Design a protein around this ligand. Structure first.
Ligand SMILES: [Cl-]
Ligand SMILES: [Cl-]
Ligand SMILES: [Cl-]
Ligand SMILES: [Cl-]
Ligand SMILES: [Cl-]
Ligand SMILES: [Cl-]
Lengths: 388, 388
């Protein structure tokens, strides 16, 4: 299933099934100038020609520590930070450190989640659904049926979330934090899209960190998908354990990402760009894309998860009389690619027809491409309701 | 043991225990000019700001294929090439693909090897020893006692080798190639230091590739230890399997390495620099370092593995009356770090005192540092022979 999807998603197509960020003109200009300065000062060469240069992993651990300490008041030191090749390698280490053979599992208390899609070890909890105005909706943690036991090795959430754009509420997160502490297991939060960088969040969300939290951050959604710089923030024992693993599997970041981050932090540009350039760009783009969708599909044929952050729209074709696996084939035959939703719910205790009524799209591509894709989508949704 | 070593090797020290390449002035100048051109042309920004840009993984697979096809006559296509974060992530995938649970093992037919050091799954064969002039020696495959069975998942060698600088002979390699084929298992060759790049080889060695060979190459020893670009050359089925894994664990390379390689290949500089700048630099440096050693230690107190390639000298303190684990502590107390040899022989069928009489050093650091380290080494060797 996923292998074919990956093949399709690679091999005038309207490609709305990917996870790459936008090319924001102001950001491209910023990076071009930054790179020009760094090459001219010798810093680019230092980054590539040294295993751990003056702006290497070590300088960055110090810079990130100072940044988080001074901007948010978090008691972080370099010993609380580890760097990886990206988000996905970060989770591979965590899963190995806390899950597997007693045999422990990773609990996703608020499915759907992307890492489950990307990678018997995963257990997804079915979320509650809150219907919202304008044909929107929001998933919630169902605490009444949330099962955490001796076999749970870690609790994992993202904020904001790929694929829904959901932002788990302060109350939900604090409850999960209390449960994790009570069960002596870590609460892992994927912050690839959140604050302080890249800041692709459109809703309220109080930041959270304490020694029982493992926080994953990344440089890629800043508009540097070609750099490979994942960041893990955790208690020093966890960081030490991660140190060892990265030493063996060797999925450390290259030098250019860390060097660029050091420079952006030094110039006091990292937070500024996230809040004043990146966030507004995506907020406008998500609003424009919803408006395009609504010209073709009402709430009677498409419910949209409230877009609280990240770069996706999660579409729920409520009561669609065919599956989105079938819809996907029909769209593909017409040159439109989106991701079937079922793939983001691995490990549910019980099957749920809902998983076959959703799809994920990326709202970043140019609007003419978005509109052409949406027009075809609406035609296929109409066809399904008319004739199966 | 290894954890402490790693801590020591990190935490006016004479650090001869690392594996980083030299900073060759002509190469630093070359990279500075190349980076300047790439930033000015937009290519650096393209590499970092795109997940798979114009000089991304795809352009590089094509470029490397054309390079190997036209320079060596190898029937390689892009489907025979996979990119990784480096040598070490490359082997993690291979070990997972061919070894482990029947349960299969990785055979090192010519120990000592570095990947065994870096990472019940490994079996090392004891090599034969050939004494050579000038107090040198060379390890050889002991075919008479080489055991390959149903439980062998793959055969793994490097050429030239970390930690010895050994270059397995054409005859030894062809025999291993025939054995691998006969047992229907791959022959994996780590070419991090060999031809066509970076070309840090000082002996004859006929290149070898056929569909049952898996060849690992890297950009780091070209003098780009901050880039993260490992290359695997293998039959398309193997490459496809590796594709999947890298998709999940996500240890793909960042964009800058591949982009720089594409540019060097396009400019016809990659092979030229390896043969005319890199190789002669290291050849002179290895000869100079041996001469320094010989001013302090004769063949009666230090045998040196014939330096046939790579960036290390492997020292055998023949019949030393203390172990090199103990010698290491004594050197460390005096500010000199080298690697105890025992760590490069995991999985020997039988213990071998020889493993406790060797050490690895890196001959790249500046000669004043080399000489200060060697002087201390000779004093400690003399002390051991005089008083234990
Ligand atoms: Cl600069
Ligand atoms: Cl509406
Ligand atoms: Cl916009
Ligand atoms: Cl250029
Ligand atoms: Cl001599
Ligand atoms: Cl030289």
């Amino acid at each position: 299933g996923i292998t074919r999807l990956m093949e399709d998603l690679n091999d005038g197509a309207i490609m709305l099934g990917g996870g790459n960020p936008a090319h924001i003109p102001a950001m491209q200009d910023y990076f071009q100038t930054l790179l020009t300065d760094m090459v001219e000062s010798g810093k680019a060469a230092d980054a590539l020609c040294n295993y751990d240069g003056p702006q290497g992993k070590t300088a960055l651990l110090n810079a990130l520590a100072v940044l988080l300490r001074e901007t948010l008041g978090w008691d972080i030191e370099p010993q609380n930070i580890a760097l990886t090749n990206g988000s996905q390698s970060a989770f591979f280490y965590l899963f190995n450190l806390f899950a597997g053979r007693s045999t422990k599992k990773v609990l996703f208390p608020l499915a759907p989640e992307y890492i489950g899609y990307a990678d018997d070890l995963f257990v997804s909890a079915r979320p509650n659904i809150e219907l919202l105005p304008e044909g929107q909706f929001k998933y919630h943690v169902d605490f009444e049926h949330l099962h955490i036991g001796e076999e749970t090795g870690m609790i994992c959430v993202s904020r904001p979330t790929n694929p829904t754009g959901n932002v788990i509420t302060d109350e939900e997160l604090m409850k999960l934090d209390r449960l994790a502490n009570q069960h002596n297991i870590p609460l892992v939060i994927d912050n690839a899209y959140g604050v302080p960088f890249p800041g692709i969040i459109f809703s309220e969300a109080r930041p959270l960190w304490n020694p029982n939290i493992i926080l994953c951050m990344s440089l890629s959604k800043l508009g540097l998908p070609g750099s490979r710089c994942g960041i893990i923030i955790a208690n020093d024992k966890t960081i030490t354990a991660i140190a060892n693993m990265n030493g063996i599997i060797s999925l450390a970041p290259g030098g250019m990402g860390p060097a660029m981050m050091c420079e952006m932090i030094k110039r006091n540009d990292l937070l500024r760009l996230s809040e004043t350039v990146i966030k507004p760009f995506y907020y406008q783009r998500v609003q424009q894309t919803i408006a395009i969708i609504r010209r073709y599909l009402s709430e009677e044929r498409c419910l949209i998860h409230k877009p609280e952050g990240a770069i996706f729209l999660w579409l729920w074709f409520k009561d669609l009389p065919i599956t989105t696996e079938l819809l996907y084939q029909r769209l593909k035959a017409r040159g439109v690619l989106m991701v079937p939703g079922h793939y983001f719910f691995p490990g549910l205790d019980k099957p749920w027809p809902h998983t076959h009524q959703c799809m994920r799209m990326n709202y970043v591509p140019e609007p003419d491409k978005i509109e052409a894709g949406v027009k075809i989508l609406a035609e296929e949704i109409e066809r399904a309701w008319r004739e199966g």
